[PDB]
Amino acid sequence: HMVPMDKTLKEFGADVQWDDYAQLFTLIKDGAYVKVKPGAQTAIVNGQPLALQVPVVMKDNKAWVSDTFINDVFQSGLDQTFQVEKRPHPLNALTADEIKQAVEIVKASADFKPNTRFTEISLLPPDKEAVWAFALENKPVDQPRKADVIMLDGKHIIEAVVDLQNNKLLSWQPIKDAHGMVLLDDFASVQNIINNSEEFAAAVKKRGITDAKKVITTPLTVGYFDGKDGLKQDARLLKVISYLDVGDGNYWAHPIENLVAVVDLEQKKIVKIEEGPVVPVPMTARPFDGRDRVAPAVKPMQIIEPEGKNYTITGDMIHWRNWDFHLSMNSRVGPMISTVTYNDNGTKRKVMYEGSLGGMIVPFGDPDIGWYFKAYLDSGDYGMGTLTSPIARGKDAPSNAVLLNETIADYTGVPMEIPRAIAVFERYAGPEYKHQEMGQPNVSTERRELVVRWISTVGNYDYIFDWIFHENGTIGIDAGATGIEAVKGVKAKTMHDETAKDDTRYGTLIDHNIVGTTHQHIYNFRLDLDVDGENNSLVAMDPVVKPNTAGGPRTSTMQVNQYNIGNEQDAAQKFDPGTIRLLSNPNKENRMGNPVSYQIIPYAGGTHPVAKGAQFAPDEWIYHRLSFMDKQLWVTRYHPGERFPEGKYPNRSTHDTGLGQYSKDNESLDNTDAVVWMTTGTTHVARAEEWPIMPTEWVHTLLKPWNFFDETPTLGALKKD
Amino acid sequence: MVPMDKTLKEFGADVQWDDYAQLFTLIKDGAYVKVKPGAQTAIVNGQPLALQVPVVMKDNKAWVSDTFINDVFQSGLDQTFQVEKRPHPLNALTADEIKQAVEIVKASADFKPNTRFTEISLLPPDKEAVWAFALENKPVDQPRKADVIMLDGKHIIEAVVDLQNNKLLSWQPIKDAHGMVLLDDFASVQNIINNSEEFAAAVKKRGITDAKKVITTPLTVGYFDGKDGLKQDARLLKVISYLDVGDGNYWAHPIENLVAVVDLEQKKIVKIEEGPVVPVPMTARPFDGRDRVAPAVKPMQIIEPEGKNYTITGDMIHWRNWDFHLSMNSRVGPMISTVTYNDNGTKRKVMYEGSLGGMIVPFGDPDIGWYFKAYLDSGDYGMGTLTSPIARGKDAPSNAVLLNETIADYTGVPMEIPRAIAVFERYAGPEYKHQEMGQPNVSTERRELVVRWISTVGNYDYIFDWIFHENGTIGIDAGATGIEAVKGVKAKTMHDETAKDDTRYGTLIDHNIVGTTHQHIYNFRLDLDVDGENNSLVAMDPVVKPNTAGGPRTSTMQVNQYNIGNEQDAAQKFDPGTIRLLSNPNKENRMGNPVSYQIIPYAGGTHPVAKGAQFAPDEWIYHRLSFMDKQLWVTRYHPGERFPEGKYPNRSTHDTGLGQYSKDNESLDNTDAVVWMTTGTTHVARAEEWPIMPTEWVHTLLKPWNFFDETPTLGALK
Numbered sequence A: 001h002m003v004p005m006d007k008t009l010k011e012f013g014a015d016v017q018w019d020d021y022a023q024l025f026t027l028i029k030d031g032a033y034v035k036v037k038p039g040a041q042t043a044i045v046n047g048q049p050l051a052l053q054v055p056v057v058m059k060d061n062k063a064w065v066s067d068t069f070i071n072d073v074f075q076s077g078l079d080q081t082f083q084v085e086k087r088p089h090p091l092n093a094l095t096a097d098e099i100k101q102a103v104e105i106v107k108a109s110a111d112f113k114p115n116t117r118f119t120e121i122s123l124l125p126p127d128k129e130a131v132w133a134f135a136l137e138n139k140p141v142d143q144p145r146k147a148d149v150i151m152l153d154g155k156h157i158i159e160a161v162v163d164l165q166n167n168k169l170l171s172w173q174p175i176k177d178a179h180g181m182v183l184l185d186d187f188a189s190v191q192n193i194i195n196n197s198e199e200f201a202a203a204v205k206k207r208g209i210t211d212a213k214k215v216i217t218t219p220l221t222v223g224y225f226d227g228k229d230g231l232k233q234d235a236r237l238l239k240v241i242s243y244l245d246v247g248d249g250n251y252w253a254h255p256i257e258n259l260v261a262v263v264d265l266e267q268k269k270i271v272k273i274e275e276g277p278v279v280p281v282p283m284t285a286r287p288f289d290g291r292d293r294v295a296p297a298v299k300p301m302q303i304i305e306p307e308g309k310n311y312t313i314t315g316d317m318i319h320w321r322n323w324d325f326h327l328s329m330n331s332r333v334g335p336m337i338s339t340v341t342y343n344d345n346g347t348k349r350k351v352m353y354e355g356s357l358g359g360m361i362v363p364f365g366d367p368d369i370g371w372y373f374k375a376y377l378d379s380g381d382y383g384m385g386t387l388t389s390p391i392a393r394g395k396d397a398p399s400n401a402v403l404l405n406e407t408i409a410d411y412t413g414v415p416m417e418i419p420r421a422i423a424v425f426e427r428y429a430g431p432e433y434k435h436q437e438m439g440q441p442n443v444s445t446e447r448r449e450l451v452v453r454w455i456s457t458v459g460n461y462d463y464i465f466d467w468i469f470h471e472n473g474t475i476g477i478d479a480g481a482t483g484i485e486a487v488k489g490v491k492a493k494t495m496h497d498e499t500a501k502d503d504t505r506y507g508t509l510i511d512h513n514i515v516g517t518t519h520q521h522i523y524n525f526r527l528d529l530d531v532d533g534e535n536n537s538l539v540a541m542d543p544v545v546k547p548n549t550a551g552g553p554r555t556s557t558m559q560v561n562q563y564n565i566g567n568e569q570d571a572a573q574k575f576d577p578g579t580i581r582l583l584s585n586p587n588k589e590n591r592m593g594n595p596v597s598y599q600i601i602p603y604a605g606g607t608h609p610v611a612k613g614a615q616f617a618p619d620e621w622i623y624h625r626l627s628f629m630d631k632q633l634w635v636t637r638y639h640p641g642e643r644f645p646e647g648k649y650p651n652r653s654t655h656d657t658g659l660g661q662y663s664k665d666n667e668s669l670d671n672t673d674a675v676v677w678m679t680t681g682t683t684h685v686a687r688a689e690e691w692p693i694m695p696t697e698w699v700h701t702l703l704k705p706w707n708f709f710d711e712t713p714t715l716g717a718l719k720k721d
Numbered sequence B: 001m002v003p004m005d006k007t008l009k010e011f012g013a014d015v016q017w018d019d020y021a022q023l024f025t026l027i028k029d030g031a032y033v034k035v036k037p038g039a040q041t042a043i044v045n046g047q048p049l050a051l052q053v054p055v056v057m058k059d060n061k062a063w064v065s066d067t068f069i070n071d072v073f074q075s076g077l078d079q080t081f082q083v084e085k086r087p088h089p090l091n092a093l094t095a096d097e098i099k100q101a102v103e104i105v106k107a108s109a110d111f112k113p114n115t116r117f118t119e120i121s122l123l124p125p126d127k128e129a130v131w132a133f134a135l136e137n138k139p140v141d142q143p144r145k146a147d148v149i150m151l152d153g154k155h156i157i158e159a160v161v162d163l164q165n166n167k168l169l170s171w172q173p174i175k176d177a178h179g180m181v182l183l184d185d186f187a188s189v190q191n192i193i194n195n196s197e198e199f200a201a202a203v204k205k206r207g208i209t210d211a212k213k214v215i216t217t218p219l220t221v222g223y224f225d226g227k228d229g230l231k232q233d234a235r236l237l238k239v240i241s242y243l244d245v246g247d248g249n250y251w252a253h254p255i256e257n258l259v260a261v262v263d264l265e266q267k268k269i270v271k272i273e274e275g276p277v278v279p280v281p282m283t284a285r286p287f288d289g290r291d292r293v294a295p296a297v298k299p300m301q302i303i304e305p306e307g308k309n310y311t312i313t314g315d316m317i318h319w320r321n322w323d324f325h326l327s328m329n330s331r332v333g334p335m336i337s338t339v340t341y342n343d344n345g346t347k348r349k350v351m352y353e354g355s356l357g358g359m360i361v362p363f364g365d366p367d368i369g370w371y372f373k374a375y376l377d378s379g380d381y382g383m384g385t386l387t388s389p390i391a392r393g394k395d396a397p398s399n400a401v402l403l404n405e406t407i408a409d410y411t412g413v414p415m416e417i418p419r420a421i422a423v424f425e426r427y428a429g430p431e432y433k434h435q436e437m438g439q440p441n442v443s444t445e446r447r448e449l450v451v452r453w454i455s456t457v458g459n460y461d462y463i464f465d466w467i468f469h470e471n472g473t474i475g476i477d478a479g480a481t482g483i484e485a486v487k488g489v490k491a492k493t494m495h496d497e498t499a500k501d502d503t504r505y506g507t508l509i510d511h512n513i514v515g516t517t518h519q520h521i522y523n524f525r526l527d528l529d530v531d532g533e534n535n536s537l538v539a540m541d542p543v544v545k546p547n548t549a550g551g552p553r554t555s556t557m558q559v560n561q562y563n564i565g566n567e568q569d570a571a572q573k574f575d576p577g578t579i580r581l582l583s584n585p586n587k588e589n590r591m592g593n594p595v596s597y598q599i600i601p602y603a604g605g606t607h608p609v610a611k612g613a614q615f616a617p618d619e620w621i622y623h624r625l626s627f628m629d630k631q632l633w634v635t636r637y638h639p640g641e642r643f644p645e646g647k648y649p650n651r652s653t654h655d656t657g658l659g660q661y662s663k664d665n666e667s668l669d670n671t672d673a674v675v676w677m678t679t680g681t682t683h684v685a686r687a688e689e690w691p692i693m694p695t696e697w698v699h700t701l702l703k704p705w706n707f708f709d710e711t712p713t714l715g716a717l718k
């Protein structure tokens, strides 16, 4: 017996194209590009013939395939994109079995508590030196696989370490005063609590809302105000902002302004309700899913690689041209790019040991009750890896992408597979280089970039991160922001209304009675670059205009002020895009005797106004707790336990436990293992073009080899000598 | 019959054979054809075509009738190009008009024997009439006219001819103006050096055994108030030399500290400047792959099997909600005109004309062969004329359409530049996306239409992309690649004695080779007409203000808004942290906000960014070219103000460009404004850019700001 081809292929996730003239089907799915003609005894997979016992059957215009067709074709072996890893990479994320094992161990602990949740369950970082030895020398890591198990018992944090190899608990340590991030059940809890609140229902009624069942809540961390917000620093709290569900699939467009409820998660009740002036809920329908729009006609455009990809995916190891790297997933920061090497004519040179999003923050600048405390620490407080948004094939990534699935642990300790978690794709990126000498044959080569894309959605905003590997050694890091804007309900319909001026003091009026409150998007990337070795130094090269002292008509010259940045404190700074900042290896030089290096560019451009630092006065608490938001470049000594710019437990934190803390002892950065942290952000002043849904806005960062190589890296293999 | 592979490939089409499907896939620009041997029909952009003669497979080689190409490729099924029945008034001069204009000036008794033409271009009707043709189909009732700029020896003469009536309207000698460098000047310079006994003498001293292997490069000399010892009235060129060692890259073998000054009218060297003797770097450093083998790569294609979403009628391009006219100019290249955005059925003005204004690449070395080095690419050399034909599939993606463009050469003869401009649509990530927890995802892909043009001047190749976003945004990117201008030095490594001094003005990128520091400064002239002619310049500076609303916050995020009323105040530095809008104070969007376009002169780049001119305010280049030190400029619309560096920048003694255009500090309140964006890079070289430099890019953007009332890409309502 057989099954309908289209339906089955679609279910499976493959693109199906029928060519009536050629009587040919073209099926695409990740690295598999297949061609099959009805009735043929063979199909083509990535240019190779594949025998089929049962041919594709065409009936009354309906195609049918056998029940084994998907597996026979798509798992044939002719698609070489993915290869089986023989020797497990030490950095492979915990498998589902390991996750379950780690949970069983802690639950077997005499101290374990029954309502305990898991904020994070991740592989405990094997020693960096052994990992590199494995990647470069293939030496086995003899230290046991261990996992960090961070638990939330009520409101108390407990860090546990388990030895998976020996199936035993190594440590169990309660972390005093730390608050746990927001967990999935916290969201349902807040909605329920609000739903059972008599007072809230009453507060809501006297604001126009009739059916309180139509109120949609969103949970926000409260931050820290040394008590000015009147909140017990000891309790596990969350503030709640509400919207009215009008049935347009966009509750974000119907704010119930000036109503904030504070919920105590352990007490499971509203401990405080802050009420302000009553502002009529913006009611007009403002769907963003196209239900009310005409579907435009567009001609097909496809990016195809008929013979397969140029990259190979062995286990989680990616090999592409001269690059080699390990790609894993973390529930808090998302994707982790490790042991990145560049194959320089046979010799694999180290570039980056570990790279990933450090952390990010989206702080608002409106002082009103529903906004003064708004500051989202997306990864830290909400867990971006966990909130990964599966890639919409052909839309969120090009049609020639390969989408990977990633596994992490949910808050209850149960393995969770995120489908299409990360997209991998090669893309044409203009001419790599070109030279059309007058009267001579032209010289041009195409540039190819390997992109690693991951999307995470937290409430109303969607963030896209691209790790771009250029064939020439450069590495790009871009962040895109899109989603639905956080708006403030206001009385003005237009800028001509009486309250307009006051309503727009902290944001643009982007719709009737709707203001897009100004805020910033501040991303921070933690890049443990190991420029051709562990021991590096930070060097500054500031292009300057110097008085000409060589004679001739010129009064000035362009020279450079080169100097080393010897410590963390001095390395923590603002980035002038007019200057050059290098992470060099003072122990290795290129053919011209120049130290092998990488130029760090925390600011390579963006489509929204650039954030020059935090848009907060120096006396603000958010400013105090989070110092990473005010400097674009930071450089610290390597420490396996320092991975977040905002600190490990940022929820309700009273002091900088992040980059402020990591650079506090102002250690030496001379010829030692350095870790670069790039902070880049935008200052978002809204406009109507961004409502009801915002067009993706991007920011770019770059890491370029500087004298790391001896010549143009993409010239090709030397034909002589 | 005729062999297919051979005939088609001669035609410029790509031929793909699929043995499993016994199908040929033929591609050329907007035509995507499928044909099976022996079939009575073929498919052209998804549509059936009856064939007179089926393709025939002989000895494993296909054969097609001698009428195949015409029948299939010109069948009418490929709708990419459409006939233009009523020519746009900005259409560039055709080959016939160029020959005609030349005959008109040649018929005058004032025309001298060996006069050359620096520029022959259309003298366009007034702006008001061009916009009415574009928006109301109103005929421009003006005769085709042309500006004919002649170079008589070293004398510039500007003439105007009436093409319809075939008559000369004016002949004006331009006092003190020096003409741009013309093609023949390259040859005279080399020839003049070749016949110089003295030059040969100086060359022999420097190690060059065969003076016939010496390659000259003509450079304009600038202006140094006589301090360079050069006569202000002579037509001069400075010559920098290299040694040809047979590696196809003379640029890698500089003959340092040797400069000759040639007087083009006397046809002789009038000065030889000599500095210390530095042995010519001899090592072969080819950049053409003769000594390399590239790694094999799996094929990748970008296909549009049913044709393009854009239509090209004459030079009028229509794509999604955009409409614009693309023409070519011999001096600045591509001109984007009468740009409108179709807002739900109504065409709204966005930009009257946009194009490269001018650009400069000034060096920072004081030495003999570098102190005067400053290339005014379009101005002194003619970038349109020097356009580099796009290498299909490489300089532009495989799904691009390559357009041919016509300009007049220096002798007044029409020259068709093949594949002069690339037009292509491209996937650019998600236009927007929102994955609401627990709900069906919402995502749409972003499509951008790019207009790409490449011009090469001497050793450097510049790529320009005019990018139209479906959502109303317009991007303008500038890429730089080519061969670096290097200085010969004695140091081989940084461990050598002269290393420190050899690298004072640039990086040691190869043994004995220093990539001299310099800047790349591009300037774009954008006659934006935001939803109309009358606009105003508005500043919006995000600031931190004390909270006065109560609550725990000590500060707030607010905006300082204010109009910039005059040209002098509009000439400014650009803080990427601020917002600069060109608003139309007479029209507002649904929320009462003035429809506007946000101007961003600096949206990013891959090389260090130029904050201004890396020159002391007393340098002559600094004085001559004010445009290099300010990122934003706004002036009153004037049809004769088109170049930031001035109309005749060769040896200019003062700013006749933007410095002159903003001179009178006129009012920019509710009037026709012209935006000029200066964007540049400061280049400090590295070994990874030698012998050939990987393309470096700079980005700029023009975004609609309350021009619309909502997300522009959602679509029309049902």
Ligand SMILES: [Ca+2]
Pocket (backbone or CB within 6 Å): A568, A636, A637, A662, A663, A664, A665, A666, A667
């Ligand atoms: Ca430290």
Ligand SMILES: [Ca+2]
Pocket (backbone or CB within 6 Å): A353, A528, A529, A530, A531, A534, A638, A673, A674, A675
């Ligand atoms: Ca390091």
Ligand SMILES: [Ca+2]
Pocket (backbone or CB within 6 Å): B352, B527, B528, B529, B530, B533, B637, B672, B673, B674
């Ligand atoms: Ca204008």
Ligand SMILES: [Ca+2]
Pocket (backbone or CB within 6 Å): B567, B635, B636, B661, B662, B663, B664, B666
């Ligand atoms: Ca003026």
Ligand SMILES: [Cu+2]
Pocket (backbone or CB within 6 Å): A481, A519, A520, A521, A684
């Ligand atoms: Cu935003």
Ligand SMILES: [Cu+2]
Pocket (backbone or CB within 6 Å): B480, B518, B519, B520, B683
């Ligand atoms: Cu350069």
